[PDB]
């Protein structure tokens, strides 16, 4: 009787834990996928931010994303990308009335799509890849001044 009781309880428990391990394995594979994807995205945004800092247009305290965001929190609270892009175009058009002798001209600077974007990840990550494709483009202005 004791052996039958033990074997019955084990017979019930073992399948439960086997299915639980199945779920755990699925979610662990998903977690590894997510970790690799977000590591790559963090490296890409790091590369972007290091690129912009190199221009020297804006100075920053340190190479920490939280510190940099804190430094400029005001502007993020103040404007939004569409607004500033529109008004930058407006200012560029207007102020070429005065400055035309300097022969301004703008040209967007862009970053190549990282090759690892190809290693398809699925639905949940596609929006972020699209977002990066949209935001990666940025505008520059150059002016001829005494050669």
Partner 1 sequence: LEQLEREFASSSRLVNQYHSYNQYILAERAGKWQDALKRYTVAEEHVKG
Q: Which residues bind partner 1 (CB under 8 A)?
A: 28, 31-32, 34-35, 38-39, 41-42, 44-46, 48-49, 52-53, 55, 57-58, 60, 65-66, 68-69, 72-73, 75-76, 79, 81, 84-85, 87-88, 91-92, 95, 98-99, 101, 123, 131, 135, 138-139, 141
Closer to partner 1 by Cβ: residue 20 or 55 = 55
DSSP result, 13-45: HHHHHHHHHHHHHHHHHHHHHHHHHHHHHHHHH
Number of C-beta neighbours around residue 71 at 10 A: 15
| Total residues at interface with a copy of itself (CB under 8 A) | 27
Residue 88 Cβ vs partner 1, minimum distance, rounded to whole Å: 5
């Amino acid at each position: 009787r004791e052996a039958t009781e033990g074997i019955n309880h084990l017979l019930e428990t073992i399948p439960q834990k086997k299915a639980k391990q199945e779920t755990c394995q699925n979610e662990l594979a998903a977690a590894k996928t997510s970790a690799e994807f977000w590591s790559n995205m963090a490296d890409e945004w790091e590369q972007m931010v290091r690129a912009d800092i190199a221009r020297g247009f804006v100075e920053v305290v340190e190479m920490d994303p939280v510190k940099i965001v804190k430094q400029l929190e005001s502007i993020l609270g103040k404007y939004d990308r569409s607004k500033l892009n529109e008004q930058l175009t407006k200012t560029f058009i207007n102020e070429q009335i005065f400055l035309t002798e300097y022969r301004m001209f703008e040209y967007p600077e862009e970053t190549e799509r990282p090759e690892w974007f190809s290693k398809e990840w699925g639905e949940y990550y596609e929006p972020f890849m699209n977002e990066w494709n949209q935001l990666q483009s940025r505008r520059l202005i150059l002016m001829e001044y005494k050669g």
